[PDB]
Amino acid sequence: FSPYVFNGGTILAIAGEDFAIVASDTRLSEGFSIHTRDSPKCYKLTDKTVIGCSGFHGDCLTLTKIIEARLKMYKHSNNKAMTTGAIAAMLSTILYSRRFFPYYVYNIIGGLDEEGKGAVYSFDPVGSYQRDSFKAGGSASAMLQPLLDNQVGFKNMQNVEHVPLSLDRAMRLVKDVFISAAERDVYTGDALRICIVTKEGIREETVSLRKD
Amino acid sequence: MFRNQYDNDVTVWSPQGRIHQIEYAMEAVKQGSATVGLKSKTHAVLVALKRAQSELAAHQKKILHVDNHIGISIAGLTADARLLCNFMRQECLDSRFVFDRPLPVSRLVSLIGSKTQIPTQRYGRRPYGVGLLIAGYDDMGPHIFQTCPSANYFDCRAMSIGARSQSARTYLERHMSEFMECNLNELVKHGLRALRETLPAEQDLTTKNVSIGIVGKDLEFTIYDDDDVSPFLEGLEERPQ
Amino acid sequence: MFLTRSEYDRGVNTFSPEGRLFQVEYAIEAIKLGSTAIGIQTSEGVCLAVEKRITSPLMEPSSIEKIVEIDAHIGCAMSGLIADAKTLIDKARVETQNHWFTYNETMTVESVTQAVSNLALQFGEPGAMSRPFGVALLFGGVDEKGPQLFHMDPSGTFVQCDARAIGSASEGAQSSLQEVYHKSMTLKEAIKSSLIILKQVMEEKLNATNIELATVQPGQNFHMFTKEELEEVIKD
Amino acid sequence: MSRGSSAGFDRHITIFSPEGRLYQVEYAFKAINQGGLTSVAVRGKDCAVIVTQKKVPDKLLDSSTVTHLFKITENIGCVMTGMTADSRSQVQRARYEAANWKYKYGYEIPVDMLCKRIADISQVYTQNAEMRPLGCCMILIGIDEEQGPQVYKCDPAGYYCGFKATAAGVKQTESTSFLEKKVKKKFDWTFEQTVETAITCLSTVLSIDFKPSEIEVGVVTVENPKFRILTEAEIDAHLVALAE
Amino acid sequence: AATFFGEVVKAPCRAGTEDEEETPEDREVRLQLARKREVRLLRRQTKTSLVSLLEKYPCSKFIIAIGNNAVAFLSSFVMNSGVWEEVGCAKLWNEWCRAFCVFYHLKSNPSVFLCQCSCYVAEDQQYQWLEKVFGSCPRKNMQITILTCRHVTDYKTSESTGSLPSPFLRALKTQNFKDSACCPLLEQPNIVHDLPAAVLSYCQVWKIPAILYLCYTDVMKLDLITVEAFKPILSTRSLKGLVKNIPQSTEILKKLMTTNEIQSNIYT
Amino acid sequence: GTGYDLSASTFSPDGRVFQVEYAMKAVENSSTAIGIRCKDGVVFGVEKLVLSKLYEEGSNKRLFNVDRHVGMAVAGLLADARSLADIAREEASNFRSNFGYNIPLKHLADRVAMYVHAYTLYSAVRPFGCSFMLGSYSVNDGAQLYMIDPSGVSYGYWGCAIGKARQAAKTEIEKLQMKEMTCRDIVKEVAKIIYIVHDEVKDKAFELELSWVGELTNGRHEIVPKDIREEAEKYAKESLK
Amino acid sequence: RGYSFSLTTFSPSGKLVQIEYALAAVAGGAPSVGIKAANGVVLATEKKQKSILYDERSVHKVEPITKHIGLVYSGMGPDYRVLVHRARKLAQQYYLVYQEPIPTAQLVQRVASVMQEYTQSGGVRPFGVSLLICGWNEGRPYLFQSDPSGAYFAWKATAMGKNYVNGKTFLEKRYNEDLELEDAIHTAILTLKESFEGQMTEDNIEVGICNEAGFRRLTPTEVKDYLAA
Amino acid sequence: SPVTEDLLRKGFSCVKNELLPSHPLELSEKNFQLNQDKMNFSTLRNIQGLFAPLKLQMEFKAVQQVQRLPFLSSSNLSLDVLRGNDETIGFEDILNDPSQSEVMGEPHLMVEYKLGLL
Amino acid sequence: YDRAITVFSPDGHLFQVEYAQEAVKKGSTAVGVRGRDIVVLGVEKKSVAKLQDERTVRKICALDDNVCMAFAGLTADARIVINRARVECQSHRLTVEDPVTVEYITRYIASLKQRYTQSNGRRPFGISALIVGFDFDGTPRLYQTDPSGTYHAWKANAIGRGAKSVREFLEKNYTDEAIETDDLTIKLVIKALLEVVQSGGKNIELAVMRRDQSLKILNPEEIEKYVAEIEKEK
Questions:
Q1: Is residue F4 within 8 Å of F18, Cβ to Cβ?
Q2: CA-CA distances (angstroms) from residue E14 to B5, B16, E20, E194, I179?
Q3: What is the CATH number of the domain that holds G10?
Q4: Cβ within 8 Å of H, I 68-107
């Protein structure tokens, strides 16, 4: 017996100037077979905060079903809505509550701050948050990140100016990076779901990706 | 006067046979403010009233919140109100977490009655003093369930348990024909007109003493207060007489 | 036909023929045997002023402190019994610090009044209590919604208020407050009005050794007026 | 318990009288006659016939679910008399105790152990200041492989004993006197003689005629240790054979 | 009740025989308590002590209002039909109170001495109050009218108390009352005690006219409906010529009720 | 014997337990209910005292179900009735959970009677004030009826009546032939009984609730269809001259 | 008296009303006599089962413990069987450890403590019973008597029970030590005869000796032989 | 799995091995009477009805609270014939008899812990 | 309306606390005053009882090397409280390597007193303390507990029967001059205690404490010498 098994996935998050973007491939694969091809991995929490949860698909559901309940409890108690600056600490506490039986997840939080500003957090299986700007991660990580490091925040480039990220550029970059990284990895592909979120709500997006 | 020895506690039967503490609690629940509980085919308005400790202070809360599809009122003791709404909220949250459907009112009210039945039997405990008017629409049309100090809940169509309200009952019974096919505005007008009878003469309903709360088909339970209740409180004719 | 002596005030859970739980009513009545207090809510912060009534000159003035910190932006003025108020303050401090550790943000005054009232509601039947808390608090502070001042009575409620006294001769400190309140006056006049009101109840005179003015501003944290600072305003 | 013990010399179980008598248990003894019944159990030399009385308050009530003769083990009976609401519980308690003993020692219980266990668990209710001594008359019946048939009686106080004949109910005194008079005359008995003696004692105590279907009879015999209840036919035959 | 497990609890008494049966060190505590609880008259002229109220002057009408509702009714309806001056009040130290017991004197024909006393007199101070207010043997021409309000959960009837109609008026009249009654008299099973009963008993035993008026309201907090229910009272010779302005008095009563006296925070 | 009637664990010089008798008397001041068994089924009927027209059908009912083939017709304090119904539901549920098939009626009736007796043995809880009927049906055993008194009685009745109007109901039921009848005329007989014994000076509104289990429903408990109820109502109304 | 009705309160003179009441109760019971002799001890008592409806077997009074300890009650019938069972359990508990039989004194102390434990508490009545126990250890005979509160005494010729003052007065002029069981049994029979309300029969005496063999209980025919002699 | 949300009074007990049972006859010996009572209660509740376990356990509770204070040895004469172990002497009273306790606590602390106030 | 702690009166006035205070106002007196760097904790002995030994019966108990103790009232309850305070002091020192301040330990004692007033099954501790000692920062400190729950940072107060007279005498003479040197404080406290007692020296005990010199009781010879020195009044 072994109370752990892999299920793949990939999470990418770009925190621009006044827009957060969370996108993820959709394929539940364990062992060598494929279970389904829809399996969305981008759940909504509030009107201005989206959670992306990769990793083992037995706790990715439990944490999703617990966070909403605790959010409802907080809203009923304090008569407000949790901002994206508190959900990080609350989820970190929940994750660390079982340090001797760790959750096998890799969560990504994206949303808007008190003012119009991008913000993407990042956790670890034991649970320790850290603010970031373009952090990605998941099963097929270590390939998504370096290209973003090259593009978003210009590194190891000289005699080049700095330009803020425009919304038209973000989707064009994300689609290209997923298309490039889908071929060389096994667990990725199938359908891609984008959850770009702005100060007017949440809008979805689905495109094809290496049809399988 | 043959009752001094048979009312000091709750676990004793009078020679006639009746628990006097239950009657005393049912008399006690009449201390508060009126609360009409009208219902319709699509919406279940819940209009209440608010008192005032003083001109300087602020008013009490009479329309709490339970979940996205259910909202309770209150009348009587304000102590046990929170202690019971906590159980309300916990049961609704557990039903949403274990299963994946909203908890129907017909089971929630039975659970509340079962919980409130315990203290009326064991020694050293006293019955609750609430007058809940649980309202909410889940799957088979909106419902209006009343709760008494004794664990004896009633189904209902429209009633105004609370403070001086017999005239409110008479008015609500006189016009209990049109409440089956009307829009939201007409139903709210009827509710406010019914509540106006409770208020003493030469007194009008201001903006700061009404707590209209509406739950229906495609809108979650929302509480209205302050100037937001003005659009509902516009026509109301001009005076009861 | 006959008159019989029937008592229902003995027993913490006994309903009288017409309601009105007698034990809680007596607990509320017991508040008046204490010290007066006042609190004014103003658009630019709130103010508090609580008397001391020193028993003997040998008692150190700072030994007794009705004003007490709860956090960097919340202050309250106890009254009545002392030890029970100390227990309530300790629980409130523990609760607010625990919430700060958990959710990583600041308190909201309603979110702590609810907690303290929920704790005080446990009267009845386990270190559970057996009598109502014969105390009263005037929570004050500033939050995102602005400056607020909450009143919490021994039984179960936390009704919002703008200016409501709690100590003895509350009628004199209430009618005058109703007559003088303006809802738009400046913070500077609040100190003067509160001192004038407090002068009407004391048998003694106004000296800098028995008044504990302590106000909180929207910008600054808790600020407790000192003897030298209070001497300037006590002159007039 | 937040109600206290009522003050008085006879208002609670744990308070002694000035002279030293438990008045509450005496009230419990007086409480058996409140229901109103009579039960007689006589042991001969190879049989343990038990007779009792049955009263139907009206006509609508069924005549098959009002019996006062329950079964404890495969070969032990009881003629419970008094308040039904307490005998109905003592019977279950005795059944559970018998099952536990059979599980722990692996053979059918002698009557004395069951009687002693019932007496002890009834006595333990007369010390704590939270109990009510439930009023019954635990009369046993059965045969033993070492001493023959035996008849034992228990009381709410907890004092059990061994009787060669017993009368329990509202007419205990005269029935006991009649049995005392009859026993001293002859010593040998038989099944028919014991049944006739019990029926005659009941008839001469109640001083009324017995309808063919008014009295049920449960017996145990050496040849048939299994506890069986006499049907209507046998009772009617014995009743019509009596005094003929 | 039972303080701890197994404790013997004595049955609470009804008649009042639980009272038990001295050395000088205890001899004074009783007198200190009595002097603290003693009643004295302190007519606010100049720290006066005053001899009885009716000894210094006679009168014909001595209407007394007991209870906050009655005081509000008298201070709202009959105050503008002339000008009144204060003659005195009293000080009490009952454990249930301390809110005043001030009398009123009309500058016109002084036969009217309407009183306002909302203070709760204890079960023993009432006799001393009667002794210090009336005396031993007053005249035989006075008429006394008393207005009081009681909780509705006192009237006893076969029907449910809650099912009973809105608050009503009941009266109790002595033998020496030629005038009729404007409302049905109280039924036999119901009795009234305390200060109104003491006043009625004194009036009956000293052979002077008297009349009692009760209100079985369901709410004890002051309001407008209950005080307005006292309207049919103003049609008898007990109080006829003292009413001169109904609508302005109603307006000032509404304004007084608008003050929003401190209610109970136990409920909502 | 006043003086000893303050706790369950206290006898009387005569020998009776006074709290139990007080509970016995306290069930009288209620409505009335009857129940009859035919050759191949049973049937009940309750005079539901309808309050003001603010309520509606499906209000507080007194014809609960305990299993797929049993049901009660409790008539007393409603909170204790609901508690007892929940206890019996739990009992039948546990029995079916591990012993297969369904509980026989006698065992369930005995268990519920013993449970309701368990309270009158201690000085911590008051006795239940309520009558209790547990008629049901079987496939091979037949049709059985039981009544449970508040204290300990669990006798088996052919047909009885519980509540205030009980003596007249018993006397009128005595003159029937309920041993060779069917389930198509005992309903009319029950209706005529409930309308021949019904006070009108203290009762104003009536609503008969009827239910039968038998060979006509092949072992299932449910309320009678509205057509048969209406026909019986008309026949009973026209039978009174 | 308000200070009565509860065993946890001292009367304002120094006493316990409930304890004295229980002592009077156990005094109002059945007479019993115990005689200590240089060779052994004898315990004599009579039963209320006078009518022939009762039985000689089954219920019995002088229940032996182990092999050297035997007791007899003079109080409430249904209120000492539990105590006897506890005494036997304590004897066996001592016997598993310390592989040698219980001496009398330790058993007396333990039973006295367990009996007293229902005095100092609150809400439970004291045991109404008072029992003698006889032992034979180290070539010596032992006799003790227990009180409802619990205070063992090294008694020698106690005649406690109903009308015990007359028995004590009668015994204070007959016993002279240095006697065998033969005369002791006759002395006990005479003491019972002094107050019996009738004549002794074959089925009214339950004498039991504790000589240096064990705790043999005299057979009914043997009791008949002694009664005739 | 709890955080802190006096160490001299209770100390020197690492969290490591209380969530690690010792020799397998640990949970069958530390908690034996409770397990036997639970099994009997379950059996009675299953076969006889819901009344018997409730009645018997509440009888246990009623008889439990009349013993001496915790800092002294309890005779436990009663509750034993009611439990059913009236004569079932075993490895519970001859080994490490609680009367001769090798270590003993303070009276006030033990009684206040028994009350559950701490 | 005074038969249980949990119940109130129609006006308030929790009566069991007041009765406990009355009981406390029956034992031997006690005083205490701080100076520049000195504290005194003198008490008086009600009876001589020459057969009895003064070694065992005493009031000035030690709580730590920097905190001392003097009570008044029933002895056994005071002993229990002192034992618990000692244990708590040691536990706090173990959990934090820092000598315990006066305020913390006096708050713990006050809380322990107040805990026994929340159920009608436990009587309150009827005693009164005079906690006094030197902090870790060198500032002299003094306090006074109370049976109900309260405590005040008094300066030169007193407890016990006949405390009003000694309190008035102390407040009518306490000045900065009298607290300058060391023996001046002893003279002042002896003059204060000489009022209630009949004859000095016979039944008066002192406990001089200095800066980190630990508690040091005074032998009768030094007390007699100090009384003789203070007898030179003119």
A1: yes
A2: 8, 20, 15, 18, 64
A3: 3.60.20.10
A4: 80, 84, 87-88, 90-91, 94-95
Q: Domain of G63?
A: 1-229
User: Hey, how many other C-beta atoms are within 10 angstroms of the C-beta on B32?
Assistant: 25
Q: Which residues pair with G166 in a beta bridge?
A: none
Strands I33-34 and G140-145: unpaired
**Helix (H) or strand (E) run with residue A53 in it:** strand A49-55
Q: Which of I4, I10, I120 sits opposite E95 (nearest CB)?
A: I10
For residue D49, CA distances in Å to B136, B187, D100 come to 68, 79, 27
Distances (CA, A) of G126 to A120, D7, G85, G118: 76, 18, 17, 5
Breaks in chain H listed by the residue before each, with C–N > 2.5 Å: 1, 5
Residue E5 touches chain G, beta carbons under 8 Å: yes
CA distance H15 to chain E (A): 39
The CA angle E105-E106-E110, to the nearest 5 degrees, is 90
DSSP 8-class letter at A23: E
Chains touching C (at least 3 CB pairs under 8 A) are A, B, E, H, I
| Cα–Cα distance measured from residue B119 to residue B125, given in angstroms and rounded to the nearest whole number | 6
Q: Give how far I189 is from chain H: nearest CA, Å.
A: 37
CB-based contacts of G212, cutoff 8 Å, min separation 6: G39, G40, G136, G139
Residue burial D188-215, b: 16+ Cβ < 10 Å; e: rest: ebebebbbbbbbebbbebeeeebeeeeb
In three-state form (DSSP H/G/I as H, E/B as E, the rest C), the secondary structure along chain H is CCCCCCCCCCCCCCCCCCCCCCCCCCCCCCCCHHHHHHHHHHHHHHHCCCHHHHHHHHHHHHHHCCCCCCCCCCCCCCCHHHHCCCCCCCCCCCCCCHHHCCCCCCHHHHHHHHCCCC
Residues of B in contact with F6 (CB under 8 A): 5, 12
Identify the sign of the CA torsion B76, B82, B85, B91.
Answer: negative
Nearest 5°: phi and psi at I61? -90, 155
Least Cα distance to C15 among C25, C4, C27 occurs for C25
Residue type, I217: I
The closest alpha carbon to C77, from C132, C149, C160, C131, belongs to: C149
Encoded tokens for H59 = 């009888």
Question: Quick one: D82 exposed, middle or buried, by C-beta within 10 A (0-12, 13-18, 19+)?
Answer: buried
Distance from CA of E5 to the nearest CA of H (A): 9
Report how far residue C110's alpha carbon sits from residue H6's, in angstroms, rounded to the nearest whole number. 34
In whole angstroms, what is the distance from residue I72 CA to residue I64 CA? 19
How far is residue D148's CA from residue D139's CA, in Å, rounded to a whole number? 17
β-bridge pairing C146-152 and G131-137: unpaired
Expt. technique? cryo-EM
**Measured between alpha carbons, how far is F52 from F34 in angstroms, rounded to an integer?**
25
Number of domains chain G contains: 1
Compute the half-sphere exposure of residue I162: CA atoms within 13 Å on the CB side of its CA.
14
Residue located via tokens 């007058």: B131
Which among H50, H51, H62 has the least Cβ separation from residue F90? H50
CA C125 to chain centre: 27
Interface membership of C56 toward I (CB under 8 Å): yes
Residue C190, token pair as written in the block = 């609040």
- Coil, strand or helix at E105: strand
> Does chain C reach chain F with at least 3 CB pairs under 8 Å?
no
For tokens 């003696």, the residue is D197
Could you tell me if C58 lies within 8 Å of chain I, comparing CB atoms?
yes
Q: How far, in Å, CA of A21 to CA of A42, rounded?
A: 11
Q: Is I4 an 8 Å CB contact of chain E?
A: yes
Which residues does chain A have within 8 Å of residue H1's beta carbon, measured at their own beta carbons? 97-98, 100
